[PDB]
Structures are given as C-alpha cells and as structure tokens.
Write a protein that binds this ligand. Structure first.
Ligand SMILES: NCCC[C@H](N)CC(=O)N[C@@H]1[C@H](O)[C@@H](OC(N)=O)[C@@H](CO)O[C@H]1NC1=N[C@@H]2C(=O)NC[C@@H](O)[C@H]2N1
Lengths: 60, 44, 78
RNA sequence: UUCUAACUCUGUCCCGUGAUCCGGGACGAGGACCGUGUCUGGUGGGUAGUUUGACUGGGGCGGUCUCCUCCUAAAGAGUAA
RNA sequence: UUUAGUUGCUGGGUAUAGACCCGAAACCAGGCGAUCUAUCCAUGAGCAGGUUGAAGGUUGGGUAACACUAACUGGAGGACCGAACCCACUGUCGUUGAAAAGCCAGGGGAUGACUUGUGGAUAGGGGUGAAAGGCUAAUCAAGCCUGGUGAUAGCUGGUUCU
RNA sequence: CUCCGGGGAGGCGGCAAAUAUCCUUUGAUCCGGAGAUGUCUGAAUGGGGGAACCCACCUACUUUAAGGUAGGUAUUGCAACAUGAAUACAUAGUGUUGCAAGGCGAACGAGGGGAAGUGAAACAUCUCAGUACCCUUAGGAAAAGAAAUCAAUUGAGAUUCC
C-alpha cells in the first residue's frame, strides 16, 4: 500500500512522506492507529491543502 | 402368537396425524397429493 | 449463514475433477472466505466482516467508509 | 533472536440478562506459527464402476489359435477330425 | 463421352423412434416405516414355598503375649430343589392343520449378565447385532412405495379368412 | 332474509310415492343483478394441542352474584417516536404506533442442483442428457432486445418465431 504519514516513524520517514508499505503493515497497524493514511489523490490533496501546517504544529 | 399390529391411538396420532404431516415439507406434499387425488379422509 | 462474501458476492461454484483417463466427477470450488475486523473511525468501532482476499483488495483500493456505505445502501447490517 | 497489531482460546471478569448458547467490552496465555482457499506430488479395497477369450466326443486341468512341405485326398481343382 | 426426367397417389424394403405382442433377475431419484423385531434412554410393576449356611460378632478354652481353638449368633451367593413367569432339548401327532410354526408327554432358568407395562431415540450401502449375514411390520448378501419405465433380453412362448 | 328488474299460474329441492298442513292474480314458485347474515378447523395469527379441542388476559357497556355483548392481544421486514448497558458522549438492546408479507392452485417462464437403466452387439472416453427428479421464484405471458454484431462486390443494420 502507498501511504503518507501523519507522524514520525523511525525507519520509514516522517511528517508527510509517501513511501511504499506492505499491505499488512498499513491495514492492521498504521491506519487503525492513525499514524498514516492511504495515498489516494483526494487524501493527498486534503492533507496538503489545509492540514499540513496543522500537523506540523504538533511536534509531540 | 403376537402379531405385528398392536394398536395404540396416541402413538397412531403422533406418528401419522394431521399436525405431524403439517410439521414437515414432505408431509405437506403428502397432503397435497391426497387432496389432488380426492381422498375422503386425509389422515388417520 | 452461508459461504458468501459480503463485499463481492462470491460463493461456491460447481465443476469437474478430470483424471488422466478423462473420468469426470463432480466437485465445487470454494471462495477464499474468512472473518476480519476493520476499524471504522466515523463510528469509533470495529466492524467484523466475512469476506475474501479480493474483498480486502477492493477495500484497500476504495476505502472502508465507501465500501460500508455501499453495503448499507444495498441493505446489509454493517 | 525478539516484538504485537492480523489471527486462536471447548481460560477469568463485566454488560445485554432472570441465560454453561451467542454478541460486545476488559484482562491473560499464545502468535505471524496453527488453520482455511486455489494449485501440486504421495498414499489410498475406505468406497465406486467394470473386466477376467474361444475350440473341446459335457465342463474343468492339459494342448492348440498365423504361415510353409508331405500323406489322408478316391490319376483336373478343392475336401474334415 | 450411356442420350428422360420430375411431382402426386398406392404398394414392397430400409433407417430413427417402444416399432409384432407378452416376460426378467437388476440399476438410479424422491418419499414412507422401530405399534413386529435388535440395542439404548426415562419412569413404574413382578418373582408361592422349602434348603444350604460365607464374612463378621459374643462367650469359653490356650499362650509371657500372640497365634490357635470350641459353642452360640449371623444370613452371603451371576448358591440348591421347586409353582407363577420367561424359554425351547427329545418324541408322537398334525402337514388341503384347531394353528402361514401348534397341541400333548417329558425338559431348562427361576434374586439375576432376570422378566415385564407405558412413553421415547437410532432409517436402507444406513441402523442395530454376547456375531447366526441375524433382525429392521408373516418381506433382507442391501426394506417398502411411487417415478426414470412400455429398462434391456443374440433367449422361450404366441401370432386370427379363402 | 332485503331491494331492483323479468314473468304470469301454479308451487312447498332429489332419492321418493303417499300424506298432512299449507302459500299464491293484494302477483307465489322460478330467472338475473346488488346487499345483509355467515358456527368450528385449517397460512390460523392470544398461549397450547393428538385438526375440527383445552386454557387465558386487557378495555367499554351491561348483571348482582360466580356472568353476558363488542373490540383487541402472533411473527418477521420497513418507517416514525419513546426509552436505554458494559462506558463519558454514543451504539447495542427494549417498547408503542402505522404499513406490508406468509398459504393454495393445471400447464407454460426464469434461475440453483442433477442420475441410471440403455447404445457402443463387452467396457472406462463417449451416449442416454442437461432428460427424469429435487429446490427457489414471476406473469398473463415470461425471457431477449437497439451492435465494443455480422459480412468480405465494401455490403447489411435491435430482439423473437417459422
Ligand atoms: N479425449 C480423451 C482422451 C484420453 C487420453 N488420450 C488418454 C491418455 O492417453 N491418457 C494418458 C495416460 O493416462 C498416461 O500416460 C499413459 N499413456 O499411460 C498419462 C501420463 O501423463 O498421460 C495421459 N494423457 C494425457 N493427460 C493429459 C490431460 O489430462 N490433459 C492434457 C494432455 O496433456 C493430456 N493427455
């Protein structure tokens, strides 16, 4: 699954990066815990247009 | 000597009775066949 | 209450076993069905569905909310 | 080697609830194994459909089953055991 | 290089259909049966009368104490004899029977792995079986009924006026 | 039984005659149309049950004794409303109201499963045949239907049936 993060991950990257992730990792861990979301065009546009600064504000 | 038929009305009604036939699909088919043939008495 | 996929509608179908001498016997092919729990944010809860791996591929491509809305519009208790 | 988040529990507690089913929640023990779908090798009288020749001084056992030469074959040809 | 066809009607033959008529033992699908019988489950009932005398117990003998022993009690047992009841070893009779499995005279068990009433459970390549391929409604090396079905038969029989 | 229309001398259904009481020109019997009444079982629907039976509850009116009249009381699906856990918002659950469905019946339609006897002069591929049979579910018909179709002179022009 292609996902963009909502927070920092030790090996994947951090804070909005688009990386290729095995379907199980995204489906069972990342999405239901809120650490990332799938890289649909609508999701990317919504994340980039308004909430990029909102997410960057929350350091911890 | 003892023969095959030892009558008991309660057992007769519970095995071959109207409600016993109504309880299953095959019994309802039996009743439908007997109605189509025109039997004067449907069940025991 | 059946081996039916909730997302795609797949179900067992019939076919033949064919031997090397060409003897034919009846069989069926079954779907790759199983249960899975999906987190649903809009309602803050886990929804458990009986579906196939193709159902998961569809869910991965389209999103869980769209699929759940489609099932509800089709008339299922999700 | 380790972990937990998929998944398992014919383990404990709580609610539906007046309930040793079931569902939801909280724990605990396991855990990417077990198990299931498709494909594939092995085993498989458990079960199923069938086959298992003819001649013959009755049948079975024995012998024979196609081709060449002589006799039986009665001075043309053909002629059985 | 062969130089009269064609379309109707009638008749002989052939082919596909049940194909001149009657006749299997079978195979398959869906239903009906444990009121007989096999095993099991729940709840009730039955077993005249008479014998034998196990364990245990008490008392007295006997021992340094045991041990051992006698008498009296006691009432065990897939114990004994024998009616009801449940069976079925021998013989006569019966064999178009009184009876589609019996009568008569004898025979076995008879407090137990016993007999029995009522109501339930198991259904056909299945059930049940202290096991005989036994029993599963007078039917069992695969029940009965209805459908496929007018199964097929190189076989047997029959086939009508001059 | 009532009304409306027709009709004009007999009538009181049949086995099934007799008899009696009778009805009818103030229009009967009879024929056609529209209404009233319509016990119990049966999808049976208040609960149960061995069909034609047993036992109930709640309202309104009525009775003074131990009752009577009428109405209501099934399940599932949908909608509105109310109520409401573990758990704080909620959801699950629970109830009331309103609406709808269930069952039966010839053949024909569509869909889900699907044999064997037989023929091959044996038999396994094949045939029988998607036939028999089982299941679900419509309509007066159903299904199909307006080319990502055929054709091969660059032509035809949805589906169905002969
Ligand atoms: N129309 C029906 C035709 C019947 C066949 N002709 C019978 C036959 O020849 N069977 C043989 C036989 O069983 C055995 O070999 C031997 N000879 O004993 C095995 C060993 O592989 O090979 C079989 N052959 C095949 N298996 C394949 C398959 O099933 N599909 C594809 C193609 O590969 C097929 N051909």
């Amino acid at each position: 699954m292609d996902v963009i993060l909502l927070q920092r991950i030790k090996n994947l990257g951090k804070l909005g990066d688009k990386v290729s992730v095995k379907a199980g990792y995204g489906r069972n861990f990342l999405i239901p815990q809120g650490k990332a979301v799938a890289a649909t065009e609508a999701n990317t546009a919504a994340f980039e247009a308004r909430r990029a600064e909102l997410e960057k504000q929350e350091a911890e | 000597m003892k023969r095959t038929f030892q009558p008991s009305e309660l057992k007769r009604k519970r095995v071959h009775g109207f409600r016993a036939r109504m309880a299953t699909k095959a019994g309802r088919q039996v009743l439908a066949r007997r109605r189509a043939k025109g039997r004067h008495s449907l069940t025991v | 209450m059946s081996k039916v996929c909730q997302v795609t509608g797949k179900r067992p179908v019939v076919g033949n076993n064919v031997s090397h001498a060409n003897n034919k016997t009846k069989r069926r092919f079954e779907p790759n069905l199983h249960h899975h729990r999906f987190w649903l944010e809009s309602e803050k809860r886990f929804v458990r569905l009986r579906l196939t791996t193709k159902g998961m591929r569809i869910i991965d491509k389209l999103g869980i909310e769209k699929v759940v809305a489609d099932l509800r519009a089709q008339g299922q208790k999700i």
